Amino acid sequence: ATPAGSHMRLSELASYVSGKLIGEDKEIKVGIFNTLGDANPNDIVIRHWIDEKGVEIAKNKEVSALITQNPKGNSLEYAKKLKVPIILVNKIELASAFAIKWTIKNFAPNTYRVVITGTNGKSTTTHMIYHILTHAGKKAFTNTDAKSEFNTLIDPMVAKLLAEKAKKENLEYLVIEVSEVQGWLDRLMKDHAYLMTKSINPNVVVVTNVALDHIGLVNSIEEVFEETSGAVKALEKGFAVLNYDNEFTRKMAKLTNKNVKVFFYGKNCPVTFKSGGIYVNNDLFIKKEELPFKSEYFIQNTLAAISACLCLNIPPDIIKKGILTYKPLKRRFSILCKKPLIIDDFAHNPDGIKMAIKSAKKLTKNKLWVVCAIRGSRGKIINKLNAESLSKTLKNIENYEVVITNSDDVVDNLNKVKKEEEKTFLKTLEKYNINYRFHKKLKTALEETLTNCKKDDTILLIGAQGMDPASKLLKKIKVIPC
């Protein structure tokens, strides 16, 4: 069980988190689950690893207990002498999950709760739902904003941030993004989505889609489906909000438990997009020009957010006010310029690349330029599948030009394109008879594209870390602002 109150025994805490207590047992006062850098007296700190310096800082900060998987050097004996309790765990996600459960129970128990997962769209959908609720004046907590995506059990950040806000506000809603496929040291943390959803005990689970990505952690879309479905199996009550247009999210309906209602959104559903607008129960809800220059994914994410909020009994006019004032995250089909139309999108897996190209073509008057940064240091397979998606999506589209780059000039060591990655990407384009130009440097790719393009063309920039710097480079070479 999960205790209520601001005390527990060290031995009880160790058992709660699947750990072993190092040091003498004691009834401790508990503050919140925190990081070492921010810890207040009596806080409990969960950390992947600690060293003797961390033990000393914990003592100075009056931390009640340190929970860790790797006590480096002389940490254990040093902590025993300083009387800093160490709880050794093997599976740190169990400590983070307990920290979330305990924080909810003790600081925000009277809340409605939504979990959002999926391969693409879970951050935007989380952000949209949070925005609808807070724009309506509701008090809510979320673990994702424009700067951060704390969607895992690998650290205590969810428990820390939740506690900090719950002490200051009477929260009514928790809006929690959950990683569907999560790694640790390039190894799959199986059942992460199940465990993290269970720790929230949500009223609503949203699954945006199932798509191939995280090659190396997984390698089949079936496995992505299995791991993602853990969020739905975790749901005890309430509503499963599922994308009807994705085959694998549709299959999750059969996995819902006894007292769970499936709520589908998508084509020929109660919440749907058709003839340029969003409809709810056959009423025109959001109109075409209320969604200017928006992508396929933006629309699907909006359908998901509407659906989740309807399942929370938010009145439709409240939902609409939120949608119309939503401020999107960075590089989500971001319009940087209108003459020429420059679109900046962080597409990075086959589905996202396909979506971005098709959405850009829909808005394209004349020539479509696609500038794509190879996904460096992520493996040959994802780059092959990405080039395959780019090639298959473009092969029937008229009047395009492909510009490929390594972004060697702007990426760090962790994102450098490896020779085998560049090779599989470019050879895939050639297999599909896609003409292309290639530049090692992003700046070269952008300068040449913007020089040769015309004012009625569209320029689509796609890529992850390799394309992140494009906005600043376009300001640098004085393309932006237009």
| Closer residue to Mg ion (CB): 194 or 297 | 297
Least distance CB 121 / Mg ion (angstroms) = 5
Least distance CB 204 / Mg ion (angstroms) = 20
Segment lying near Mg ion (by CB under 5 A), choices 10-18, 326-334, 402-410, 440-448: 326-334
Least distance CB 302 / Mg ion (angstroms) = 11
C-beta separation of 406 from 457 below 8 A:
no
Identify the residue among 127, 331, 332, 384 touching Mg ion (CB under 5 A). Answer: 332
Can you tell me the distance from the alpha carbon of 307 to that of 291, in angstroms, rounded to the nearest whole number? Answer: 18
| Closer residue to Mg ion (CB): 120 or 428 | 120
Least distance CB 360 / Mg ion (angstroms) = 14
| Closer residue to Mg ion (CB): 58 or 181 | 181
Least distance CB 132 / Mg ion (angstroms) = 17
Per-residue HEC secondary structure of 250-294 comes to: HHHHHHCCCCCEEEEECCCCCEEEECCEEEECCEEEECHHHCCCC
How does strand 7-9 pair with strand 65-71?
unpaired
Least distance CB 417 / Mg ion (angstroms) = 24
Query: CA nearest 291: which of 283, 308, 307, 303?
Result: 303
Binding to Mg ion in span 361-390, by CB under 5 A: none
Least distance CB 442 / Mg ion (angstroms) = 22
- 297 part of the interface to Mg ion, by CB under 5 A: yes
| Closer residue to Mg ion (CB): 150 or 194 | 150
Least distance CB 103 / Mg ion (angstroms) = 29
Binding-site entries: 37, 47, 51, 53, 69, 91, 93, 184, 187, 190
DSSP-assigned beta bridge partners for residue 218: 215
DSSP per-residue letters across 408-470: TTT--GGGPPPHHHHHHHHHHHHHTT--EEEESSHHHHHHHHHHH--TT-EEEEE-STTTTTH
Q: Which residue has the tokens 């190396």?
A: 216
Segment lying near Mg ion (by CB under 5 A), choices 5-13, 102-110, 229-237, 328-336: 328-336
Binding-site entries for UDP: 37, 47, 51, 53, 69, 91, 93, 184, 187, 190
| Closer residue to Mg ion (CB): 123 or 229 | 123
Can you tell me the distance from the alpha carbon of 319 to that of 332, in angstroms, rounded to the nearest whole number? Answer: 21
Least distance CB 119 / Mg ion (angstroms) = 11
| Closer residue to Mg ion (CB): 348 or 384 | 348
E strand or H helix at 311: helix 296-311
Site map (CB under 5 A) of Mg ion, residues 216-255, x = contact:
----------------------------------------
Least distance CB 293 / Mg ion (angstroms) = 14
Buried b (16+ CB within 10 A) or exposed e, 125-156: bbbbbbbbbbbbebbbbbbbeeeebbbbbbbb
Buried b (16+ CB within 10 A) or exposed e, 432-467: eebebebbeebbbbbbebbeebeeebbbbbbbbbbb
Binding to Mg ion in span 63-122, by CB under 5 A: 121
| Closer residue to Mg ion (CB): 285 or 297 | 297
- 209 part of the interface to Mg ion, by CB under 5 A: no
Binding to Mg ion in span 428-457, by CB under 5 A: none
DSSP per-residue letters across 22-58: ES---EEE---EE-TTTPPTT-EEEEEEE-HHHHHHH
| Closer residue to Mg ion (CB): 296 or 448 | 296
Site map (CB under 5 A) of Mg ion, residues 123-162, x = contact:
-x--------------------------------------
Site map (CB under 5 A) of Mg ion, residues 252-291, x = contact:
----------------------------------------
Q: How many amino acids of this chain bind Mg ion (CB under 5 A)?
A: 4
User: Could you give the 3-state DSSP secondary structure of residue 180?
Assistant: coil
DSSP-assigned beta bridge partners for residue 116: 177, 206
| Closer residue to Mg ion (CB): 113 or 332 | 332
| Closer residue to Mg ion (CB): 121 or 238 | 121
Residues 6+ apart with CB under 8 A from 455: 339, 340
Quick check: bond before 481 cis, omega within 30?
yes
Can you tell me the distance from the alpha carbon of 335 to that of 343, in angstroms, rounded to the nearest whole number? Answer: 5
Residues 6+ apart with CB under 8 A from 168: none
Positions touching Mg ion (CB under 5 A) are 121, 124, 297, 332
